[PDB]
Amino acid sequence: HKCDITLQEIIKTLNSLTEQKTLCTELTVTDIFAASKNTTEKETFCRAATVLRQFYSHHEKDTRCLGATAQQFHRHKQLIRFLKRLDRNLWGLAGLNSCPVKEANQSTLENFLERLKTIMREKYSKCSS
Secondary structure, X not given: OOOOHHHHHHHHHHHHHHOOOOOOOOOEEXXXXXXXXXXXXXXXXXXXXXXXXXXXXXXXXXXXXXXOOOHHHHHHHHHHHHHHHHHHHHHHHHOOOOOOOOOOOEEEHHHHHHHHHHHHHHHHHOOOO
């Protein structure tokens, strides 16, 4: 149908993490892509959003990539802060806000951004008719 400003923004945020992905990549997140997820992109985004939440928000600490060097710490906050934008603003790009799940496969946050990125890439391209 068309593209909204919202997704162009999203793709910018995803982008600017992909280019600064290294120390706190890899980390294990819910694999919301490996169970007959051939449902709507919007659902994938709903269900994907929740995991980004538990990511940026649960972590905000847990030492888990904090990197020790007060310096590396600044990056931690940086990603987590943007990931917050993405969380709060994935809801807008998704539409829905009721999509629990129960994926008990696991994947990486490296792959989470890839597999997230792809679906916006997909949905942003085929924006038109």
